[PDB]
Every structure is written in C-alpha cells, then in structure tokens.
Symmetry: D2
Subunit: 207 residues, 4 copies
C-alpha cells in the first residue's frame, strides 16, 4: 500500500482551528496532517505490521531523532493489539541515529542481535531514500529472517533508490513539513501535528 | 464557522483505516477521521472555557447522537479544568426529543452548554434553546460537532461545516445503526438499502 | 470475575500526587481509584464482554446519569476490539434513567432477540438492577448481562451479582468518574472518597 | 515530593484482571504499577515540571533505552499544556544512552533548562555521572525526572527533582523497562515470575 495519498493541491487546515504552541503561530502556514489523523492511520498500520511480521520475534528499530514519535505510537498500537488479541509475539527495540567511508550509525546493540529476527525499520520520512537504503544494507549483512521498512511519510519526489517501503503512513507532495518529531534545525519537534513551515519560520530558525 | 469541508471532499479509502468488518460493505468512504474530530474538539474545549469558564458550567447532552461528542468535549474541558490555577464546578444533564426534562431547575444561574451532534434544520437547537432559556440560566451556548450547509438555518461552537450529504458514525446513526463507529463516514448504496426502515 | 477487589483498609492516594480540580481540594479525602486504573480495568472488561456476548448483535444500554462515563469508555474499548478483529458484530446503543420508573429509552421490544449489555455505575443493595432486569427479561432478549464499574461489599446486598465488575469496594461513600454527590464531582476523572466537610457543603 | 510511595508489602494485581500480552502470560507474576496509574502520575508531573522549568527554553533529554516510554508520555503531557496556554515556550528534544553514547553537542545545553528523563534511579551512580557531565556546560538549570526511585540501602543518596513512584527493592519490568531486552513491549510495570526469569536469563 502507498498509504494515505495527500494530493499535491492539498490545502491543509487553518492554524486557528487547532491547538498549537502559540510560539509557532507565525512560523507555520497550515496544519498539513492533524495529529489525530496520524493516530488513526498508525492504528491500521500496526495491524498491517502484525499481519506481515507477526509470528516471529520482532526487533523494532527506531531511527532517531525524527522517527521517535511515530515509533512510540506505532509500538503502542501494536502493544494494544497484542494484549487484546490471540495472535501475539515478543518484540524488542533498539535506537539508532545517523551521523550528523560514509554515514556513521550511532548506537545500536550488536548487529548479531538482528540475526534470525523479523526486523522493522521505523523512519519519519522517505525523500531521497538514501537513509532507508543505508539502513537496509546495515541490517541485511547480519541475515535477519526478514527486513521491513515503516515510514510515516513518503514524498512524491524523484528517487534513484528502488526499494519501496512496506508500511507507509502518508504519501505527501514535495513540501517541507515539520512536526510530530520532524524538525527544522531542531525546532518544531514538539509540535503534535505535521505542518508546512512558512517562509517566515524557515527564515526565523535558519542555521 | 468551524472546519469547512468542501462539497467535493473525496474523503478517505476505508482500507487505510481500522473499521468494523460488518460495515465494510455498507460504507463508501471515511469522511471525517476520528482523530481529526479529537483534534478539533481539543481546540473547541479551549474555546468553551475561554467564554464560559468564569462560572459553574452545566453541560447538557442531546441524546442519542450527541453522546460521543459530549463525552469527548467534556473530557477535554475536564483536562483543562484540573490543570488550571482556578477551576469551576461542572455538572451534567441529559435530554432527548422532551425526555429527561425533569429537574432542569439547577440550570438556573449557571453557564449552560447545549451539546449537539448536528445542526441541519436548526429545529432541535431552537426547541432546546426555548426550553433552557425558561430556566433563566446565566448564559446559554450551543456546541455542535457538525453544521450542514442547508437552507433551513447560529451555534457558538462548531466542529465541522459539511455539505448536504448523509453522514453516520461517531454516534450519528442510520436507523440506529453505525453509532458504533469512531469515524464519521458516508454510507454506501448497499448500506442505505440494507438498513432501510 | 468479581473484579479488582479493594480491601476495607485501602488507603488510596494523596490528592497532591494527581491532577484534580483545585476547587474540589478541601472536599475530598483521597483519590480512591485513579482514572487510569479504571481505564486499564475497563479495557480488560471490554474483552471479557466480547468473549461472552460477541457472537450476536449487542444492545449497549446506558443507565443514566452515573453510568454514562463508564458506558462511553467501555463501548470505546469494545469498538477498538471490533474494528481490529477479523470478526465483528453490530452494536446499537440506548439510554435510560431510573428514578422505580424508567425514563426514556427505546421501546422494550427492540431488546428482543439481542444480547443486551446493561451498564451501571454502582451496585449497592442490588435492588435497582434486579428490578431493571425483571423488566428487560419480559421482552425475551437472547441474553442480558450487567456491567457495573463499582460493586459495594455490604450486608445490605440482596444477593444480586453483576456479570462484569470493575471494582469491588468497601462501604465508603465515593464520588467521581460520573458518580456524584448531589450532581457534584461528576467532572472528576478519578474515583475519590468525599470529605465530611465536602458532604456538608454540597 | 518523593512521589507515589509503594510499600514493601505491595501485593500488586492479579494478571487476569488486566489485558496482558499472551507471550508473557507465564513469564509475569503480577501487575505492579498499572499503565493508567503511570499516566495519571505523569500528568501531574507534567504540570510540576512546567511550573518549575516552563520559564525558559526546555531541552528534554531522554536516557535510552528504558526511559523512552516515560519520556514520550511526559513530553506529550507537557506539549498538551504548552499548546493550551496563552504563554508558550520552545522545547527541543535529544536522546542519549549510557560512557555517554550519541547525543547532541554538549554545547547545546548551555543556558537552557535541561530536563533529564530516566526510567529508574537505583544506586544513583548513573545520574550523578550524567549530572557531573551536564553541569560542566553551564545550563540555566538541570532537573531530573525519573519514573521510578528504588528504595534500597544501595544508594549514593541522590534524589531526582520529579518522581513518579518510589518502589521496594524488587526487580520490575515493563513500560520500556527490560529484563535482558525483554518485557519492554508491555504497557504495565510488572514483576517477572521465576519461570520468566529463567526463560530469559542470559
Ligand atoms: N523535517 C523534514 N521535512 C521534510 O519535508 C523533509 N524532506 C527531507 N527531509 C530530510 C529527511 N532526512 C531524514 C533524516 O534527516 C535528518 C538527519 P540530520 O541532518 O542529521 O538531522 C532524509 C530522508 P532521505 O534519506 O530519504 O532523503 C526532511 N525533513
Ligand atoms: N445521522 C444523521 N446524519 C445526517 O447527515 C443528518 N442530517 C440531519 N440529520 C437529522 C439530525 N437530527 C438530530 C437528531 O435526531 C434524532 C435522532 P438521534 O439524535 O440519533 O436520537 C435533527 C437535527 P435538526 O433539528 O437541526 O434538523 C441527520 N442525521
Ligand atoms: N455517588 C455514590 N457513591 C456511593 O459510594 C454510593 N453508594 C450507593 N450509592 C447509590 C447507588 N444507587 C443510587 C444512585 O443514585 C441516583 C441515580 P443517578 O442519576 O445515576 O445519579 C442505588 C443502587 P442500589 O439499588 O444497588 O442500592 C452511591 N452513590
Ligand atoms: N529493568 C530494571 N528493573 C529494576 O528494578 C532495576 N533496578 C536497577 N536497574 C538497572 C537501572 N540502571 C540503568 C539502566 O537504565 C535503563 C536503560 P538500559 O541500560 O538500556 O537498559 C542503573 C540505574 P543506577 O545507576 O541509578 O543504579 C533496573 N532495571
Ligand atoms: Mg528516513
Ligand atoms: Mg532533520
Ligand atoms: Mg441537534
Ligand atoms: Mg446507577
Ligand atoms: Mg535507565
């Protein structure tokens, strides 16, 4: 599934109709994906993941920083299924961050711990697909039973990387979005909605 | 005016959300996702407290269809109230069209919030305002999850303004069915026929 | 399934460790059952209900006013089960108030042939629910079950036991989570023991 | 405040009263702190944090791994406060694992209100070490929030600024707290059975 298709001409929502941190009011243009919509989609995704990856021990990899909200919420919905259903399997977690002869993968346990396990990579957004590709390579060379990619967002943008994510929250236009742990120079992570920055905000927090 | 939903709103694919399977063939699209309703209701809760938070609030639930909006709106208002330096009492009552119009005498001198699921003709809102005002409250306000763009009809708090199409879910029914649905949805052909009177 | 048994010597919780409306502070003794504990218990109760009643159309009957919160949350947990399971059953809802005479509600004949779930806030003597069942039984439901958030241990009990129980409590006067004292404290999200200095005010 | 003080004689709750993942049914002995109770406490703690620290830019620092759930939930409560307030403050987040592994540049802490979030304080060694590091970079302030504080004679004598629960000298798992990486996928804080400990023993 490509996930919830958010069309290129999606207008989003007026900021004044939602609850927002008032110190971001002029830094945002529109609410793009309301927090609650993310929850509803993430509920379904949790079931899709259990459908495909259930039946054997899952190792859930959180891609920091931007993946942490989606990760926490996805796993909570998975946990909700597993304690209210007959079908259930153990799930362990790990956290990696890519470096701010290529990208260093900060942290993470011994790579042998993924061997023989159903591995779920959880990302915030697929743009160039290079983040996803490096992580797929970094996991595959330790022979898990399977590797799957969950991503909150996928941008409709030209991509050389072939692999398509297995679980997708929303497929969005090529707009620069923030919120729900997605940042602009470390700001907007505390926003619960996904929003499009304004040119004002982009200039205000520019590094 | 609330969150304005267009006439050409395509809604969302059912297969992208969690829905009860027994309605899978009776629904066409998800129209307003549950989470969107929650987000909008969080904002409305803050709006309500800004206007009415100065004195004892009586929240009046309009059964049946208003029960979920009522429960959620109140929970958000309760959340604000227990995290504020200054709080006010809140009490509740329930009416259905007038059933439960017995001992509304404690509406007197209070800030009364009528909570409805949908305003279409406005006849329900009109009827309840007429009744509540006779108890001489300190104020009367109306919160409605949905307002339809229909010639018939104003509410003080509005979740969403929707087209003139038939919606179900989030306690809104079609012949008493579809209330057990967290989303607001558009009913299919088979659905309207299957649950027809 | 008697529910979470709360002992006579349950100390409850200091009010200052939780969030509560500040105007209720002097009127409460302790938090007795935290909101979250109610949610956790209600979650399990939802699944118990579906295992027992999920084979056929459910009519969820809310006993206003005190039963409304438990009703709303219970059904929400039941709804979560229903939309995430391969199998699922229709559910309708109705509302009545007991003043004993029944106020409001659909025609009793709508309950016929259905699995009827009666949702209540508290059972004390049990006379209220016993009378209610005696009326509903006359219209031949496939099944009638009662879910009560609270059940009091008391010799005043006539012997009626509900089918689903949140919490079995001592004979203390509790308020909150839609349970009231003269229409007050319903806006409390926890169940709390009311003060004698609050009992006298309201 | 020392938080919610749980006694050495705390019996916990029977597993059959709550929703439990079936792959841990044999491995767990008892629910110790229900998930909802944690939420209720975390809500109050969110308000305490903002009262103290909500006057300047807060840097929320998560101590991986076991702190991640408490961190995410505490932040969500703080975010809820912040978006429903006339005056709002910016918040940034960072993650670290203890040798301190992979954080932001330590220079980002300077002049900020740093909130360290941990799952449990036991010997206090971990936190005194971390606090020694952070203070060398002259933050405006440094507070510590820990979900649990263990009541043990084995303690350096360190007390965090915000405490969820003070527990007995017992081994607990759940709510991201682990036993050999297991039991993180559990919403409740619980006590493992002897059969569970042997099963997941290194
Ligand atoms: N907040 C945000 N909003 C966007 O619309 C966006 N598009 C790309 N990116 C960068 C996302 N980025 C993922 C994480 O980048 C942050 C790494 P940092 O520069 O060390 O903070 C690249 C995804 P890709 O490997 O598939 O191209 C965005 N970030
Ligand atoms: N389920 C549903 N979907 C709709 O799109 C709709 N439009 C009007 N109505 C009738 C709603 N109706 C309110 C509820 O009618 C009684 C049914 P109950 O509230 O489910 O017990 C009249 C509103 P009005 O006095 O402003 O015209 C609709 N119902
Ligand atoms: N708020 C509250 N706290 C208590 O601790 C309590 N104990 C008994 N009751 C009264 C319960 N109940 C009467 C409920 O009062 C008024 C109905 P409402 O409109 O839901 O508030 C009798 C049940 P029974 O036929 O099994 O004896 C209590 N109410
Ligand atoms: N799961 C669990 N249950 C316990 O009751 C417990 N007590 C100490 N510990 C180990 C906590 N430990 C830190 C481990 O933090 C959890 C993150 P992890 O290292 O990724 O598992 C030392 C705290 P201290 O320096 O104040 O003594 C426990 N773990
Ligand atoms: Mg990525
Ligand atoms: Mg970035
Ligand atoms: Mg109406
Ligand atoms: Mg009752
Ligand atoms: Mg730790």
């Amino acid at each position: 599934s490509p996930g919830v298709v958010i069309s290129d001409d999606e207008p989003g929502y007026d900021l004044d109709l939602f609850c927002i941190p008032n110190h971001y009011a002029e830094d945002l243009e529109r609410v793009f994906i309301p927090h609650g919509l993310i929850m509803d989609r993430t509920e379904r995704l949790a079931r899709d993941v259990m459908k495909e990856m259930g039946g054997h021990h899952i190792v859930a990899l959180c891609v920091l920083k931007g993946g942490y909200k989606f990760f926490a919420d996805l796993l909570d919905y998975i946990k909700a299924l597993n304690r209210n259903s007959d079908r259930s399997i153990p799930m362990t977690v790990d956290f990696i961050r890519l470096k701010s002869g290529d990208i260093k993968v900060i942290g993470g346990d011994d790579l042998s711990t993924l061997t023989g396990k159903n591995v779920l990579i959880v990302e915030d957004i697929i743009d160039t697909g290079k983040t996803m590709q490096t992580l797929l390579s970094l996991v595959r060379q330790y022979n898990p039973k399977m590797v799957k990619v969950a991503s909150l967002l996928v941008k409709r943008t030209p991509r050389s990387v072939g692999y398509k994510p297995d679980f997708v929250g929303f497929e969005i236009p090529d707009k620069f979005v923030v919120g729900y742990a997605l940042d602009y120079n470390e700001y907007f992570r505390d926003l619960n909605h996904v929003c499009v920055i304004s040119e004002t905000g982009k200039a205000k927090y520019k590094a």
